[PDB]
């Protein structure tokens, strides 16, 4: 399942072997024209042994890394380059990121061509994978994953009520239009637009309306994405319920505007990959609660 592609040159032997019994400390030493220099420490049930320097070390180009006993490297960044010669591309920058808080400086020239690998799903970092020798050509680690079936989309968890009938829509082919309606109290009227089939669906107030009117934004579905939400909740009197009058949505290249006024409590929805098609919550008259769905809409 996850297992991330050994992105760059092909000029050493170094990649994914079960010859290495351990490691301890990793350098990349970025020379003239690139990462030139590398060492590879191991630690044995006593003590450490060195003597794994390889390439060609200069005053101006070394790094240092000690790996802890304890510490998960649990993303990093890598870029590669290539110039007009370079028959076997390089590396350029690594920059390790650990699970303790631990976050080393570029190794190199940060540079547009590059990938990123993180784990989320609980995996932990193993060993690495990538030909090198003199020259750094490609770096990477693989992941621990599962192996489970093609599923359905996932459901997931809001916060808001525990009374009021439930409107979840589950999905819809997609958004292509948006308003909102506000109220004297918070969100109380929400509207959406999409197309079925070949249908053109217009209207969608399943909320109490108010004399505030609409608001309205047409989000290019083919050319931008919802990748999170945002809102914030304050807490209403009288009853244990909570209500909603400042709710966002994150938008990138755009700039969604700041509907309604933020106070209360805050609160976010957001996944890896999967992007958002559908709600799930409560109302009656005011929006209650409000959730959304993931779905991977990934190429």
Known sequence: AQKVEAGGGAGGASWDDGVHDGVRKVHVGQGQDGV???????????????????GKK??????????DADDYIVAV????????????????????????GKTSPPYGLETQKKFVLKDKNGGKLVGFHGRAGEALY??????????TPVTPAKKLSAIG??????????????????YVGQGQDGISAVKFEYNKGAENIVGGEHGK????????????????????????????????GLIITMLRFKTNKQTSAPFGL???TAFELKEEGHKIVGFHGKASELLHQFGVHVMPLTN
């Open 36 to 54: 030139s220099s590398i060492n590879v420490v191991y630690a044995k049930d006593s003590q450490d042994v060195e003597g794994g320097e390889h």
């Open 58 to 67: 200069t005053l101006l180009g070394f790094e240092t890394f000690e790996v």
């Open 77 to 100: 960044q890598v870029t590669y380059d290539n110039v007009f010669g370079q028959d076997s591309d390089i590396i350029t920058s690594i920059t390790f990121n650990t699970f303790k």
């Open 138 to 147: 490609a770096l990477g680690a693989y992941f621990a994953t599962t192996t």
């Open 161 to 178: 009520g525990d009374e009021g009938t439930a409107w979840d829509d589950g999905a819809y082919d997609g958004v292509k239009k948006v």
């Open 209 to 240: 309306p108010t004399l505030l009117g609409f608001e309205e934004f047409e989000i290019d579905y083919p050319s931008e994405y919802i990748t999170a939400v945002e809102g914030t909740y304050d807490k209403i009197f009288g009853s244990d």
């Open 262 to 264: 933020e106070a209360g």
